[model samples]
Target: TVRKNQATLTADEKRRFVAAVLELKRSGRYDEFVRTHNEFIMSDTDSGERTGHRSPSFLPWHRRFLLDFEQALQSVDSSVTLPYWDWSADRTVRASLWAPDFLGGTGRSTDGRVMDGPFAASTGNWPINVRVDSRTYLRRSLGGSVAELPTRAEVESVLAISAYDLPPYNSASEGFRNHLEGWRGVNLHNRVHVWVGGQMATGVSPNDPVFWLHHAYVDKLWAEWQRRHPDSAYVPTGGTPDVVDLNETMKPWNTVRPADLLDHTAYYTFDALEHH
Candidate 1:
């Protein structure tokens, strides 16, 4: 699979991707994926048994999750594949990604509700089925929760760290994992979620298709990290407490371990991966 930037998708590519996504929603399968992610986000903790987020497994877990999503998309349209959103470059609310043809523009000022696009509540194609509150509509206040998304310089700074993760590999860790995961310095992943606001900033963030693009780029960053630190690898290699060790298989899918996912080439490659 070749994962390209969301901005680079051709007209045909965009059409196919959108159709496949809507089909998934129509089949009632997409909501379950959102539900699954919410379950993990609520359960996975830094202080307790963690598998999905706030730990070293965050990268690989998302890699697998995105893989599952991409595979489903392919079932709908074999030509469709997951695309990455380089938010650092496409920082503005007016980016092509938010256009009426794509995921749609930012929500209105009053309630953060998306008033356009296929997923817009007015279209009646997308609904907030699995939600935390009574208000049910696709919502997004782009750059609302956070003033700015991480820049290329900020991303590079976190990537410069050699270790995959450090001691107490959780939200409080000082290593590359936590830093990239946005729990530590500069804040990469979580900050983007916050910036998007709405469902994206919550535990059931997968309710938004933007969640996949966001994580696709995060997964690409992991691949970029591997390329940058050829000698360095996943930490807690043997056995660890609370955190997911390199060889320890993750939850939901006990068959795969972090070791199996260290190499991104095993599944897909980025359109362009820069290392500096």
Candidate 2:
């Protein structure tokens, strides 16, 4: 279960993945995933219990969520797997990931609608059913919202943090989790969404197929963090009020805990993970 970079996905892999995603969308199972994420985004609190974002559980929760989505993809096409986008490396509108054969390119200016690729509105296959705006088209503004993606040096700085997460582990916390989550430090994950613009910058971000690729890379960073700081671990070991302790089970799935998902090898491995 090795997740490769989106840029490296073989032609067959790309075809299978696109087909699987379209099947999921056609079955109407895809919008529910977006809805679930929106629910958590709306309910996630900085001071209290949080599951989807802005908390220590952010990494593990998304790991599980991506796992569920990956499983679903496999059900549709067993040859398909989630691939990551190393925005630091492929940080250009010209990157192959945006090619029509892949996820597609930036949107046209008239309405910010993507005019190419499989998910393009003109294809009539991908619709913005789960969104904040009334637009029924897919849109993106590569490098429009932000001038640049996080550099590798910035990512290295975040990976250098020793603590897994700190007290009041939310957006305000000073630790690897918040930094990697892009609420603090040089900003990695969130800024990419802003960079892509459109629905990616909103709560219903998963409405974009790129959402999975973005999160897959974020999840890879967590795995890299573990390798870098073997002694450092998830905090609030026990008795934390409204906060998910390292071992406490997360919502939407009572069976799994943050502790259970800290290790990525149990689920999948990245094609390349920086240990230093």
Candidate 3:
């Protein structure tokens, strides 16, 4: 299956995508994803075991994560595939992804409750089951904390970095991973999360269906980086303490190692990526 940009999805594709996500919620399989993301974000300290974020594996780990999510959506409707939100282009509340028929727009001011779209708590379908507080509503404040998403030009600058990762191999590292992870440089991934606000800015961001889309784009950027620099590869090859080395197995899914996930083509492709 291939992932396409969210802005390009046809009306029928949008409808199917929403339906599959709702089914996952209805079957109670969706809550665990939110819980798992929250667990990792909270525990993935820079000084300790880090798999999901703030590490070189940030790229590969999320690749595995998005693949798992795409598989779940696929099981609901084989025709459905995860689409990415190119925040750089569709960087506004007016974007179609937030339309009432799609993922819905920002939440209301009083309680940050999303009063429209399929995932609205008012609809009685999408509830904030796994969260920091007891606000069982989907909420977002588009361009709230951050004024804007990263522009395509800014993304181009970060992608120009050839080194996959650097020493210490954590959030503090200065390389493609940290820069794209949004801890250093132009702030790519984390900025979008903050821009979305509400639960999206929290550790339990998966509650917002856009999380998958955002990560899909991030994964695509990694793929693009791979193409731009064929010689550059994942670093910290061996004997790295308090971090997952290239060969070390990541938690939550101990079956695969980072080295195993470097090549995204072994799993899926993106419509944005050219033949490589």
Candidate 4:
């Protein structure tokens, strides 16, 4: 079945999902995803050919990237697929998704590193063997960055904006896409890095297991946005110099474009997405 939202995932599904991710890591392709992301994250800027990391392509860039990761996971185990974490609804430990069988609870003070989760360092199944930092283990400092992950309430406030995206989409703009993506305004991508507070919060973020979870949720928001505005679609549509317009193909994959990933429903479905 199409695995969309994390809420709908069963324990068996979660285990299979973890296994699929681990298999990729074992094959050495998983680390490439991390490296590919870092390459674009540091390079995709407002100027020059922007496709993988920055510019308006940021949303679509990541969308395509996540799909690649998801496809890789499926290759390992077809029963397993990427599951999204709705941090907005799962803003606290009280949410049902954080149960022991799911993602598990938040980390304590000093070190937000999770020790009990399925992907925990203790499991030995998920290791930080391929990382860019000294800390070769899963670590998190939740609430340490700015106190708690962005709640669903906070995300709803931003999604209400009428404009799909701000013009001159550099790093600065006011819209659901930018804010939710965390490129501008309060800072979406950067902020999440800081929030994670580990190798992921740094150049070696790819090593972190939570990295996939974070992006999965971000992808969910994009899916939700598409559902809310069928007419409202991917930006930088055409003839936009130096930007990866929806038609432009993303690097590495070189085969697909943002236009291909605009609809998550085509590939998967969420347990429940906000309609408005």
For residue 257, what is the lDDT in candidate 3?
89
TM-scores vs. true structure, each candidate: 0.98, 0.98, 0.97, 0.85
Q: How many residue pairs of model 4 clash at the backbone?
A: 7
lDDT of model 2 at residue 17? Answer: 94
Give the whole-model CA lDDT for all candidates, comma-separated: 0.91, 0.91, 0.90, 0.69
Question: Please, what are the lDDT tens digits per residue for candidate 3 over residues 1-276?
Answer: 888999899999999999999999999999999999899899998888788899888888898888888899899999898899989999989999999988999988888888899998989899888988777889988887889999999999999999999987888989899999999888999999999998999999999999999999999899899999999998888898877788988888998888999988788777868544
Instruction: Report, for all candidates in order, the number of backbone clashes.
Output: 0, 0, 0, 7
lDDT of 4 by residue, 190-211 (tens): 6766765756676557666667
Task: After superposing candidate 2 on the true structure, give the runs of residues whose Cα lies further than 4 Å from its correct spot.
Answer: 274-276
Q: Predicted candidate 4: what Cα RMSD to the true structure? A: 2.7
On the 0 to 100 scale, the lDDT of residue 164 in model 2 is 90
Candidate 2 has an lDDT of 0.91
Taking the tens digit of each residue's C-alpha lDDT, what string does model 2 give over 38-127? 999999998777888998889999999999999999999887789999999999989999999999999998888999999999998998
Looking at model 1, the pairs that clash are: none
Model 2 lDDT-worst window of ten: 267-276
RMSD of each: 1.0, 1.0, 1.1, 2.7
Per-residue accuracy of model 1 over 238-274 as CA lDDT, tens digit each? 7788777888898888999999988888898889987
The TM-score measured for candidate 3 stands at 0.97
Give lDDT: candidate 3, residue 105. 90
The residue ranges of model 1 lying beyond 4 angstroms of the native Cα positions read none
Q: State the RMSD for candidate 1.
A: 1.0
